[PDB]
Structure formats: structure tokens, C-alpha cells
């Protein structure tokens, strides 16, 4: 119950390893970072996250 | 200290901001950008903003509520 | 001392030692100390204690603080108020006074609170078109005292600084080495 | 032995030292290199051997002394050099 | 030597100009009290909301 | 059980959302009546079968 | 008037764990002692494992906790649990109501227990953001209504600092090292060349702007790149970079012999 | 497998210190010991976290010792539950230099890790920087010395900067920094040379065994000694220095032009200023 | 009864390598341990014991605990024909007890003699001293050749001992079976503990 929704989006691109340009799948673009064990390598342009 | 205030403000940059495209700049330390959300505002530009690099419409880092150009 | 506390009282120590007559080196030390300390209160203090070793000449004290009047830091700008407010407490210099009125608008209420106080410490008996400014200064308190958006920092000093001016049925003064020192004068400060 | 900055040889020197007639002398040197013993080069035209460097073996007590003395000298350089660079540029320190 | 001598010249010309150039110097005070109050008011309003 | 469920469920505000992909890698994304896609890793109250686009 | 003193090791362990958890509000516990009614000292910290859900009451793991406690006893780190850290990455420092309930679950354990919120991401390199406080931007959540703020300081040592100084130091064999010369020459040949093209730029800006104002100025220089900050900035590299390289050699030649 | 450069985060430093003064362990006849978690996989070793290990030495001149294996394998997995990515690497003793049972117990830690490393934190700091020193054990089987560094991760950047702030260097630029780093290196050099010097004395006195392996290396130090204000070098340096002059003759110079231009602008502001002021003095 | 830390000293050695009564001495050691330790943890819960190997490679074979983890640990073997580390082993077992957990636990040691017992009397007694200094409880399991006795072991329990079980009590194990029955007598168990 406490558990919770998670926004969706495609990676527009990877600014830095952790810095990302992602257009919200439900709207505008944002500068954001990764998590950790997500695989900064996998994160790639147009990848839905 | 001069180095402090400059670094301390770094927080202003943050990390989870809202990209915007640059539009026009009323003049010194100001301009109108576009929001990816569709907003288009007169916003304030951080002294750091290595300006020179401000063509006519840049994809731009926007503070969220301070809503200004990072 | 690593600890502000010792450094802190050091100035006061230096004061009670060198209060009244200026020891430049002391002042010089006190300055550079206030200059050289991380902790602001110490500096604030260090600035405060100046007006003791700087007692006998309130003269340059405005010119003195006219630097510290204008500084990034509130504490500095805080410690300003007292010493000058102290040096001229039993004296004149609306000139000295007027320096503080901007500080009375320094965003930190605690600052102006001090400034409020510092003024009144000078302003007793000096009032009414002798010093026209007292009206505002008084009203400023009242203003603040009226103001809900001014703190109980702000109103605190205000009400007090008011009461300061009105201490001893407003008919009494504030005196210290105005002639020979009296330590009891100092102590309350 | 012919060191420090003084390692060079004619072919004659090696001949007399090794009692080898001087044609081989360059065979002897070349083979001295190919085993890793020496590094360096040969200039025939003038019949010299510049020996970049020579493999070091060992020594006894006395040979150490020269080492301590040599170190002392190259300590003196620093002390003086380092201690002599602060003055002009005392305005830069942290 | 010729180069060294020249450099000292440029430097001096840069030092003297920095010590002389360095001299309508007054009318200083950013921030404000009127505006600050306004800002405070705004904040209060926001809080209320 | 009944307690918190009523608080979370009792919330008569309900934003209907048309399911999209029912990833079983128990995950599943949905787009709201607000036209907003949220990947919920906890399908919560609602069996898989109940699930489909 | 009330305050807490947060030892260095605490604060660094703190920021480390927080910055490592992005962005799932981690949590852990705080080890310390209550000096008087006006003070709490936090000398130690240990980290509490994650869970399918964010920070909350049951997130506190008794087994884990005591299991750590005794373990530390053997090491002589015996001290009360004086508070609990936490992180609200990106959302500043405040307690959600859910933060609150848990804070109560630490009230009934000790009435003076405190809450510490750390904010990893925003926390800039300058003044690290940290906040400690206990119940009754942030005002939206009733900073003063349901709870109230406290103050913080840091217990120090002349050595601690001394270790940290070498943080941004250099190596050993350093100072005598001479970067590849040939490669350096490119910087001076390539750097000077790039400046050359600028030299004309500065000329055109002086001959142009020579007849204008600052408002008109913003139109010119917010657009393009004035060659002023380029010549002055560019000269910086050549100057110091060349001087260090020139100086380095001067020493190696005389010194190393 | 084979690794070269070792990286260390400042949190192991502060942690180990607090272990030192936490446990009141005398720096004369006693040391502190704990273990190290991080990443050993690649050809560097990134150290991040650490925790304290209770252990005893055998009176004076320890023949035996004790380290609690149960404490380890009880704590380890209790760290795993926190950040799983931090793997048990090696241990440390804060005692100035190495010791005797060191090489013995590293062999022990080979049970709980793969490669196993041993670094020594200097808790006294009375010496110069780099209180750490990094070591491994290779075959024989001695400790190879490794380079180290203090590499601030973002979080430690934030932490150390907020704190050390009241102690950091305030001069940045670039020239002051470099010219400092140098002299720091010169001081370093002079130290090493001492070391070798009086040692060799101990060689000639301190019952010097032999160490024909060191003496070889000293010789090789001499053989590598650049002599020689030779007609060759004298030209090299000369031809090089001039290149540097040309670059300097430009930078300094043009830079001076920039100040000049700026001065001109200032005179412009003054001239215009007095015109308007004196204007106003009319009425 | 007991609140104190203990150490179990096992020689797996020229005696333990060799069955002194079923199945081996070293094995005869084993269940006797648990037997003991059971009564030890029955003496009180929290009663802790060490387990260590001396020989040519003295070491702890498990330490600190209070339950099965020893019985766990002891489960695996040792060098069977090994040799005396006793002094060292003991001196370890001493230092062991110096780290004994949650003190107010007195120091105790229980020692199987599976070795010919090579040591010097002073060292032995220096131990005995060090023990008594440290204030260790010391009881020994010895079936030696002859036995190991009229020797260090005999002086030692004496030499440790001002007060018996605050310092030392001896039993020198006799030939044959009935270990748990045997030692039921000796203040290795029961009596003063």
C-alpha cells in the first residue's frame, strides 16, 4: 500500500554518466541522474525508463 | 569568501531541473526561455552562466520554482 | 583557544584589561582576531569589546565601524551596533547614530534589534528635535511593536530600547568613564 | 671504474686491457651488450665505445662510504636549492 | 635577457594601470527593506495557501 | 487489514487508468485518465487476470 | 539555545550512505550521549538496511539493531541511540507526517531523541545541508506547527583536519615531474594560434562597441563571445603552464646532477 | 588480477582515527586494527568503507596474537545487508610502520577475501601528508609497496569541503598551487636521501647484513644520474627556454594591453562622471 | 553457576591422533567437550568458551560464542598427529580471555593434553603466574604417556593457584573409557566450576 507509482520516460540522452536528458513520457524534458546499479552503460538514447 | 558564495550557490544548480530552450534576454541578467511544459517566462540568469554561449534558442537548464536559468 | 569561548571572552578580557584607553595593538589584535576568526559571534563579540578599549574615544568609532557597518556578515554588522552604541551611549553623534539606521534595516531582525538597542543606549535624554530622529526610532519600535511581521527579536529590542530610553522614568542617564571609570557601569553591558 | 661521467673507450684500451687483438674488440663489446651486461654504442670511425650504462654487482664496507658521501653531496643540493627557492616567492605559499 | 626585460615592462604597465585605474566611487547597497517585506508577505501568503 | 485499506481505498477519489503493458518481469504500466503513465511495481489490489490492457 | 554536536566521522558516514542510496530515502541510527537539557552529542552512526518500502517504523530492524549494538560493545563504542538519520533527496529538509509518526516511536524510547534529515543531492560542495530537530519551504509542512528546528555544530580535532588537508594534495614523485615537452609545445603553438584568431576579434569589438552603451552592449555580448575574456583567460594557461614547466626544468638541471 | 594504483576515500581515514581515539590505544606499545571494504575487481583498488576489528597482541614482542573470525563473519554480512556492493578486501593497522605478525595474518585474511591488501593509516599525522601507505604481499612473500591517493567521491567532496572549509587553501589560481607543489616535492626528496644515507651507515655500523639487492639499486640510481652540462644538453635546454620566452613575451604583453584598454574605460567613466556632477552643481 | 569465559584447548596430537578410548582420543575429546560445554552452557547460558589449536600452527579453531557454534566449529578435524603449542596455545587462550565478551565473565580454560608436553617450568609458571595475574580459571584434560604429570601440569595447576577455581583445578585423564564418568569426579566439571 505505501508502495508507489514510478514515472516513465525515454532517455533523450545521457548528459553525463549520471546526468540525463529525459523527456517525461507524460510531458516535458528534465535534467536527471541515474541510480547506481542501473547500468549507466545500458541507459541510452530513446530508452524507456 | 568570494570563492565561498560562488560555490555555495552551486546548490541553485541542483540536479533534477527542467530543461528549457532559450528564447530572448530582455537585457543584463534576464531573458525569456521556453519551458518544455509550455511555459515561457522572464527568468533570471546565474552570474555563472558562461554567457557567450547563449545563441538565440538554447536547450537550457532551468531551476524549477526559482524557475531561472541554470 | 580552539574554542570560541576562550577567544570570545579574550576580547572581553582584553576589554576589562584595556577598556577605556585604546591599546592599538590590543585593538589591532582584536581587529585581526575578529578579522581572523571563523566564528562570527567571537568577531561580533570582538567588535563589541572594541568600544570598551575604544570607550574613551567614541570619536572614530563610527569611522571605525564604518567599515564593519558595511560587511557581508550580520554578526559583524551585529557587533558593530553595540560598541558604537556603547561608546556614544552616554554621548552624542547622530552621525554615529545614523550609521546604524541602515543596520536597523539589516534583514536580520536580531541585527536591527541590536541596532534598536544600540541607538537607544545613546539616545536617552537626547531626544525631541535636539534629536528629531528619536521620533522614528521610537515609532520604529512602535512600528515594529505594531508589526506582526517583525520578530520578537525585533520587538524585543524595540520594546526594550524603548524602555531603555524610558528607564528611570526616562529621567536617568547612562554613564561610564565620562572624570573616571566606574566598572559597575560597564558590567550590565 | 672509469666513472662517473668518463665512460668511453678506444679500441686499443680494450685490446690491452683484455689482451685481445683489436678486430674482435667490437665482437667482444657487441656480445657484452647482447647478454644485457652493457648498454651503449660503438663508433668505429673514431674507434670509441660510449657505454651508456653498466650492470652493477656488489661491494664491501669501504665501497659504501663513497655512497654515503655521494648521497651527502646530493643532499646538500636540495637543502640549498629548496631552502633557496622560498625567499623570492615567499608571497606564494599555502 | 631581452625577453625577460620586456616581460617586466608589460607587468609594470599592468601593475601601474591596476593601481591607478583602480581610482564616481560611491552609492552602494544592493538588497532592500521595502522589497524584502514584499517577499516576506508573498511567502506568508504561500504558507497560508 | 480493514483499517488502512479503508483509508487508502475509502478514498472515493478514483483516477481511472487504462492499463497498457502487463509486464511479468508482477510489474505493469498504466496511463491515467489524466493522460499520465506511471509504472507501478505493485499492481496492488487487482489480480493479474484482472489485468490486461 | 539547544544544540547538537555532530562528530566528523558521523557526518561523512552520513553523507556517504545518503549519496549512495539515491533516491530511496535510506535511514540509520545515531549513537551519542545527552550532556544536559541543552545538548545532544552524536559521535557515531550505523546504517539501517533497505526495504521494499521507504523509511518507516518497521524499517527499523530490532534484530539488526541489537546485533550491531553488542558488536560495537566489543569495540567499546557503547552509547545510547540518540536519534535517527534519514534523507529526503531533492526535497530539502523537513519531516513528512510519516517521518513524524516514526519520530514519535523514538519519543517514547527517549523524550530527547532527535530527527536528522540529510539531503544528499542538493547538498552542495560548499555548505553541506543538514538538519536536526524534533516534534511538538519547510513551513508548508509546519516547520513550527507539528515540530520545531534545532541547531548543529561539529566536534573537531587538529589531526582529523590534518588528514583531510592532504585530500586535495598531490603525490610524492610529484613536483619534479616534467610533462612531455614535445606535447607541451603543441599547447603553446596550438594555444597561441587559437588566440591569434581572437586577437582580431578584440580589435573588431573595440572598433565597434567603441560607439555604444551597456544596454546595447547586452545585445552584442549575450549573443556572441567577446574576445576579451578569451585573451585574458587564454594568457592564463600560457603564463602559469609555461612558468611551471620552465621552472621545473631549471630545478631538475641544477638539482638532479 | 594484478593491480597497480590504489585509491582511498577519506571516510576510512576518519573512521580509523575515531577507532584510535575511541579505543584509547597508545601509539607507543600498541596499535589499532580493522578491515576494509571496497572494490578489488579491476587493476586498481577503490577503498571506500571500513570497520574496527577487536584483537590482541601477545604481551610485549608478540609471538602469537588473536583476531576474532566470528566478529568478522558476523559483521561482514551485517554490512552486506546495507550496501551489498562493498566487498571485504583487506585490513589495516594504524601502527606507524609494518610489524612481524603482519605477513602472518594477511595470510589469514586470504580466507575471507581474494587478493587481500594491507594499508597503514598514520594516526599521529606529525609527519607530512599521506598518512596512509598501501601494501600487498607477493612472492619469499614480502609486502610490495603501492601508490595511494585520497579520492573524494561526491559525498566526500561535499563533506570535506563543508568541514575542512575552515582550514583549506584560499589561494587557487594555478601558479601558486603549482609552485607550491614543487617545493613540497623538494622537501620530499631531501627526506628520502637522508633515509638511504644513514641507513647505509647502519650498513657500515648497524650490523648491516648485506642487501646486495639494495646496493645494486643505489648504483642504478647513480648510473641514471643525468650528468653533464654537455655541449648537447646545454643546447637542448637553451633551445627550449627560448620557445618559452616567445610564449611568455606574448601572454604577459597582450595581457598588459588588456589592462591598458580597461584603464582607458575607467578614465571614460570618470570623465563622464565629473561632467554630470559638475553639471548638477549648477542646479 | 558459572558466569565466566572459558577456552577449550585441544591438542590433536600424538595422543589425539591415537584412540585413547572410543573412537579416537581426538574423537573422545569431542563429545566430552559438548558434554562439558553443555553443562557449561547449562552452568549458565552466556557461559562462553574458546577453542584453539597449538601444535606447529597454534590458532583459534572457533572463539567467543555460547551455544552450538563451537560444536559447529569443533566439527571439523585438525592436524591429527600435531604437536605442542600449549604454552603459546595457552598464552593465546590467555589473550583470548583478555577479549572475552561482556566481562564480569571470569577467565577459564579447559585443556586436552594430547602432546608429550614440551615446555619449561618457569615459562609454564609464568603462564600460571600470568593466569593468576589475569585471574583465569584453569582445568586441564590430560592423558599422557605415562601420563603428562610429575611434570609441568602438576606444578602448574598448583602454580596458578591461590584460590582453586578462581585459578586452577587439575584432572589428569586415566587410561580406559568413561570420560564423562571419569571427569564427573574431577573439577574439570561440577564441584567448583
Curated annotation (Swiss-Prot), chain A:
It is found in: Cytoplasm; Nucleus. It comes from the Eukaryota. The modification N6-acetyllysine is found at residue 23. Component of the 26S proteasome, a multiprotein complex involved in the ATP-dependent degradation of ubiquitinated proteins. This complex plays a key role in the maintenance of protein homeostasis by removing misfolded or damaged proteins, which could impair cellular functions, and by removing proteins whose functions are no longer required. Therefore, the proteasome participates in numerous cellular processes, including cell cycle progression, apoptosis, or DNA damage repair. Belongs to the AAA ATPase family. Component of the 19S proteasome regulatory particle complex. The 26S proteasome consists of a 20S core particle (CP) and two 19S regulatory subunits (RP). The regulatory particle is made of a lid composed of 9 subunits, a base containing 6 ATPases including PSMC6 and few additional components. Interacts with PAAF1. This is 26S proteasome regulatory subunit 10B. It comes from Homo sapiens (Human).
UniProtKB/Swiss-Prot annotation, chain B:
It is found in: Cytoplasm; Nucleus. Component of the 26S proteasome, a multiprotein complex involved in the ATP-dependent degradation of ubiquitinated proteins. This complex plays a key role in the maintenance of protein homeostasis by removing misfolded or damaged proteins, which could impair cellular functions, and by removing proteins whose functions are no longer required. Therefore, the proteasome participates in numerous cellular processes, including cell cycle progression, apoptosis, or DNA damage repair. Component of the 19S proteasome regulatory particle complex. The 26S proteasome consists of a 20S core particle (CP) and two 19S regulatory subunits (RP). The regulatory particle is made of a lid composed of 9 subunits, a base containing 6 ATPases including PSMC4 and few additional components. Interacts with NR1I3. Interacts with PAAF1. Interacts with TRIM5. Interacts with ZFAND1. Belongs to the AAA ATPase family. The gene is PSMC4. It comes from the Eukaryota. This is 26S proteasome regulatory subunit 6B.
Curated annotation (Swiss-Prot), chain F:
Component of the 19S proteasome regulatory particle complex. The 26S proteasome consists of a 20S core particle (CP) and two 19S regulatory subunits (RP). The regulatory particle is made of a lid composed of 9 subunits, a base containing 6 ATPases including PSMC3 and few additional components. Interacts with PAAF1. The chain holds residues 75 to 147 of 439 of the full protein. Belongs to the AAA ATPase family. It is found in: Cytoplasm; Nucleus. Component of the 26S proteasome, a multiprotein complex involved in the ATP-dependent degradation of ubiquitinated proteins. This complex plays a key role in the maintenance of protein homeostasis by removing misfolded or damaged proteins, which could impair cellular functions, and by removing proteins whose functions are no longer required. Therefore, the proteasome participates in numerous cellular processes, including cell cycle progression, apoptosis, or DNA damage repair. It is linked to Deafness, cataract, impaired intellectual development, and polyneuropathy: An autosomal recessive disease characterized by early onset of deafness, cataract, severe developmental delay, and severely impaired intellectual development. Patients later develop polyneuropathy of the lower extremities, associated with depigmentation of the hair in that area. It comes from Homo sapiens (Human).
From Swiss-Prot, chain I:
Keywords: Isopeptide bond, Phosphoprotein, Proteasome, Repeat, Ubl conjugation. Residues 5-188 form the VWFA domain. There is a cross-link at residue 122 (Glycyl lysine isopeptide (Lys-Gly) (interchain with G-Cter in SUMO2)). The keyword Coiled coil does not apply. GO terms for biological process: proteasome-mediated ubiquitin-dependent protein catabolic process. The keyword Amino-acid biosynthesis does not apply. One of its GO terms (cellular component) is proteasome regulatory particle, base subcomplex. GO terms for molecular function: identical protein binding; molecular adaptor activity; polyubiquitin modification-dependent protein binding; RNA binding. It comes from the Eukaryota. Component of the 19S proteasome regulatory particle complex. The 26S proteasome consists of a 20S core particle (CP) and two 19S regulatory subunits (RP). The regulatory particle is made of a lid composed of 9 subunits, a base containing 6 ATPases and few additional components including PSMD4. Interacts with NUB1. Interacts with SQSTM1. Interacts with UBQLN4. Interacts with UBE3A. Interacts with UBQLN1 (via ubiquitin-like domain). Interacts with DDI2. The 2 UIM motifs are involved in the binding to a multi-ubiquitin chain in a cooperative way. Belongs to the proteasome subunit S5A family. This is 26S proteasome non-ATPase regulatory subunit 4. It comes from Homo sapiens. The gene is PSMD4. The chain holds residues 1 to 193 of 377 of the full protein.
